[model samples]
Target: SIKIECVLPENCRCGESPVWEEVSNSLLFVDIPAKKVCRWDSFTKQVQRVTMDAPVSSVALRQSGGYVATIGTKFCALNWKEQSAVVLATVDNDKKNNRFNDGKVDPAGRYFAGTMAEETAPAVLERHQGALYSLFPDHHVKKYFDQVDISNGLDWSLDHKIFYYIDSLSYSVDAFDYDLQTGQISNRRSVYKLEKEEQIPDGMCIDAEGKLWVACYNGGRVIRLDPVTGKRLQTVKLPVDKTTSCCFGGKNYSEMYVTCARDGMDPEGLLRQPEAGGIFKITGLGVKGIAPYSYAG
Candidate 1:
């Protein structure tokens, strides 16, 4: 059995992006509904938190400096020392109901993420008003596609030839032929699909071996899948029902850090798993993940 530990004792309302910075030996993440971003110092076991003016959904390290984060409807680069964002680009004002969700930087230094409608009823999961976006290093933004419920999970092949994405409502991992130099993708296909109801795939990351680790929201599990064939390769169960996201971190990239949510859990669900929104660490998988790509901006 894989040993699991609750690393961050605080419960998150809607915890998303758990990014691992191997160089800094740090793990960062967001408490979405709480409007806070935080970093966990592995060495000291101390957590540094910054409250945001808006719900910060995702964060990726910048190769140039600072961080690229999703602040409300704007994609901004934030300097932690200063603790704010410089809005590089913003979504259309007409899409006010939608807010940015999970995202990451591609290998070529392009920032990618998508948006979803804010759920009026926490128990209602169907949200169809969403679109994915990509921001180039030059700060030019483009709308990639539409009709997504929850935009989550962004990753690329180590060779920079393939891109993997998740539109959570679709319950599938979309694979694309990627153009690294131009940050363009084509030939959309499903590399993996989930059949179970409410086992919505939330967030994911790629391993050095080309497999994917996907957090199954409402299912209490993080599953490993074959990126090309969409076959179930492995499964690591969790104590939380609303597992949100995961990333591999630690000095050797040997640990899989996970995030969950307490926002939408019903009375019974919360009672069954009291720590539904805690951050968790999964070990003993024997698989290694690469450090996430940094936005070159």
Candidate 2:
């Protein structure tokens, strides 16, 4: 049996969105409420933080080198080597209540993300206020979809034949008919449904074997499900209730890394689960995952 190992202390309020940077051989993730980007080198156990101007929802590698990040309502491409950032797009034209949430890169190397109102406000899921957007090479932004509550997990199958996404409040993983040639999706359908007892899907990754591993918020486990049938095959329990996101990294690309959170928990709940905000790892999954494709430089 594979067991999960804690890699970082419980410090992040909401640690989510893990991505592997093959160029640097490191794992990058974000602490959303903390407004920081974190990197961890598995070889040396070294960890570093980069302060950001806003809460960073997610980060993706760019073909030109460095990273593309979604910060609140704005999207920027960062040159990590130069410690500089260039604005790519701003979703909130007037700086309203909406902000980017979870996001990922498509097989074609475009950054796809969704937005949501800040949790402190009275926002309902599926309100259509939040929409999905894709950032292109020329810095042109296009709305891909609308009417989203919390856009969460964003991934595609290894063959690029299927695209998987999540709307947090819906407690379901939706699939879209994919057109790899034109980079379009349609024929949306719910492929995976989560029960109230299970954690709402947050971030997800599809392995080479076509198995989807989902991080469950409020569920306390990383679940492996069949991408086609949505039948769960395995569950790796975590110490924290909020397992935010996960990715496959390490030298062999078989090591699974998971990010978690300590947000929205009561005092008693925090006391009961001390390691709510931490990074965790697990082995022996018998499958590997493809590295994140970089956005076209």
Candidate 3:
């Protein structure tokens, strides 16, 4: 059995992307629509916010002191101390319909992120026109997938041979043979398709047991899956309806921290679930997560 704790009492508008920084002993995440990046310091047991002029959907730790993040439609190396950034790459600059969403770093050091169609468009959430990209240490950007609806969780295996990615709109998850030396992926194939009982998948993280923990948006649950077997093994339910993203943390990376969103909740929804936008902690899952990879650039 697993128990959960609410870390942030107040709630976020669109709380996503939870990254644990083992070196600094802190947790980092983003509030997308609110245009802010947040940090929770374990030593102080307090959460801090850094505002961005544009919406930021995800963040990654850079090998250098600062961080790398998606700022609106562009990718930038951010300086939290000065609250500034330099745009390194911009995707989907031709239209206002898309922006950067979720991303992570590979074991070999490149930053990989994907874009999503804006929910405020004429067609709104159903429009599927976004792309996935890779940002290199030398400042080169590569377009890998051109037709993505919502890019979500992306991670590699401990053996460095397999890469898993989620394009939420497809209602399926895919696996690829990974080339760690060159950061290239090949032989992509679907490993998990949504069961009739499941909802859309969101953020994800890999475990030491070679399984996956995936958050379910609008489903209020996190599911553990055996990627090799394409079967759901376990589930952890949250109080909120819109569970956004989750990641592992704690001194030993045994505990999982989850984030939720209050973005689409109606008045009645919020009334029933006041903690919809909160950060949550789950314990006693009997599994441990691997370490986060930082961007070498």
Candidate 4:
């Protein structure tokens, strides 16, 4: 049986992008709508947060120091200690209704993130307005694709040849031919498809064995899949829905750190799932994860 624990209490309104910071043995994650960048120390189990000037979607460790994040429409270099963000590059500025969502540093140290149409309840979100962008160390921003509806999760394969991506509305996990040198991708193909009852696939991470652990929004579980065979392998059950994203942390990267959200829950829904926005630690899965890359910038 897998050992599950809620390391931190309910804190984030929409916690996503859990990145394991090996240096401090802590987990770095973001509360998107709350505009908070948080760090949870694995030893003390304490959480610390710094509020950004605008919505902070994802946080990746920078090679130079501190962090790089998608804040509002601008890609910025963040100083966690001083609580400051130096704008690196901006995107989707003309579309005031779109915001950056999920992002991570590629193995080669390039940062890839995308934007999505801001959520406005009672109306179906307009599709194909957002785009995926890559910010190089020298501060050059390149547009990869623009037909994104809700760009959610993405990571590269162990060899850095295959890129796996998820656009929430697509309901399918797509793979791309990635060129590590040029930071280019092409030949988009669907590797896995979500069942209608599974709701939406939110954030994702790949294990050492080349398997994907994808968090299901409104589905309350993280499912492991074999991208090569397009088969489901395992499921990590959670006490609450709205699981946003997950990553590997702890000694030897044997532990899985998951982030959840509390947004859009009704009063009674919140009552039963009080820890809906809490961070969870799952162990004893007999699997390990590849160490995440830091932004070379």
Candidate 5:
């Protein structure tokens, strides 16, 4: 068993989609319900939060500088140095009951994000009204796929030949034939299937070895699985029940960073697991992750 070091940062709600920023040597993630983007330094074990007016679902480092984020119903760019927010794209104008959920940058540097229905109608969560979109550097937004319910994991292999995706409601990881030159995906097929008993697969990352490390939301574990066979290779137990996402960072990108949440827990559950909303680190995984690519015009 590998030794796991879990750190409880500030309590967060719906923590998800962690990534390593190579330039800054920092791990960045978000709290969907808290409307904040957080950065953590692995070396110092220090954490910082940047509060947003609306829930910030995901963030990626910009090649030039600062950061890009999916802020609630709109896509926004943040100038960290200047402390300014610029609207990049607005997906939901009505603001009726939709918000950005999980997202990641493609190997080509294009940003892809998905949406979720508001909690007022959990039943409506099954509507599949949400969509997956790609945001270009010029702020042009294009819908890549639609009719998706709870879009979660979004990642591509190092070779850029396979695109891996997950919609939590579908309970399976879908693979697509990817065109590196054109940034297109087709020939969708299932690469992994999670039984109803297993926790839903949320956020995921592909290591340099091509293994898929997925966070098992509500399962309190992170599982590394074979991308082609969908066979589980290893599991890292987490203190929190809602393990949201995992990424590789550190000097050689060999450190595994995980995010968790405490939302929707009962009193007994809170008492039993005090470290429910926290971040975790695991070393010696023998897997290195690719840094997020910045979208270019």
Candidate 6:
């Protein structure tokens, strides 16, 4: 039997990028507008958070010791314990309206993250102004692609031959031919397309079977997709809309942790879904996920 539970019930403004930290046996995640990075311990069931000076979007464990994170428009080396960060690289500083979004560390230990224009006016966004960047271990940054809208989910195929990404406005999961050694990507193609009603696809992760689990923002569900067949294989419904992102964690990677948001909800809508911006856990899926790679630096 499948069980979905509300594990932590804080109303985060924008909860995203849940990553399993094996060293501590805990789950770490971010709340964007809240400027908070949170850790929830598995055994103790206690949550600790660090407040950042900027809107921190994503975080990945680093091999050298601490963490690599995107804070606003700067790529930073983060000390989770001390809550201090040193800037590694900064981009889009000239563009006052842009900020970093979702990101992950590649198999080769490079951190790849993208930027999107912050919502300035009601229903107004600077389309195609956002870009994707790769940060090497040497502290050098490279800009790969310049055209992106709501840069989101990212993962690599098991063979490291394919790069899967999501630009939310495109309504599709795109694939790129990837070169592991040089950290290069090319030959873009669509692997999975979401219907208009599915809302915008947010964060994603891969299971041991190589199937994708995608969170649906405003759709309130996590979908299991087969990249080969481009089919929706299974659906895990959540109690709230605005489901943001998901990651696999806990005991042998048997559990999936999902993040949510209360950003777009009004008073009435928020009342209907009290757990709208909380973290959730799903169990008994019978699938395990590969551990996320930490940045080599």
What clash pairs does model 6 have? none
Error of 4 at 18 (Å): 0.3
lDDT tens digits, residue span 1-297, model 3: 888998775489889889999887888999998999999987888988899998899999989878999988888999989988889888787865678889999898788999888887311464667888999988789888777888888888889999999998777878999899888889989888876455778899999898988888887899888889999899888988788889999878998999988887889999999998998989899999988888888
lDDT of 5 by residue, 125-181 (tens): 546768888887677887778788887788898788989988888878889998877
Candidate 4 residue lDDT tens string, 106-154: 9889999999888875114778889999999899999999999898899
Quote the lDDT for 224 in model 4.
Answer: 95
Q: Candidates ranked by TM-score, best first?
A: 4, 6, 3, 1, 2, 5
CA deviation > 4 Å runs, candidate 2? 121-127
Each prediction's whole-model lDDT (CA) = 0.86, 0.83, 0.86, 0.90, 0.79, 0.90
- Model 4, TM vs. native: 0.98
Runs in model 3 deviating more than 4 A are 121-123
Better of 3 and 4 by TM-score: 4
TM-score top scorer: 4
TM-score of 6: 0.97
The TM-scores, one per candidate, come to 0.95, 0.94, 0.96, 0.98, 0.94, 0.97
RMSD of each: 1.6, 1.9, 1.6, 1.2, 1.9, 1.4
Residue-level lDDT of model 6, residues 13-58, one tens digit each, is 8999899997899999999988888898988989999999999999
| Greater-TM-score candidate between 1 and 2 | 1
Cα-based RMSD of candidate 3: 1.6
Which residue pairs in candidate 4 have backbone atoms (N, alpha carbon, C) closer than 3 angstroms, thus clashing? none
Q: How accurate locally is residue 268 in candidate 5, as Cα lDDT from 0 to 100?
A: 92
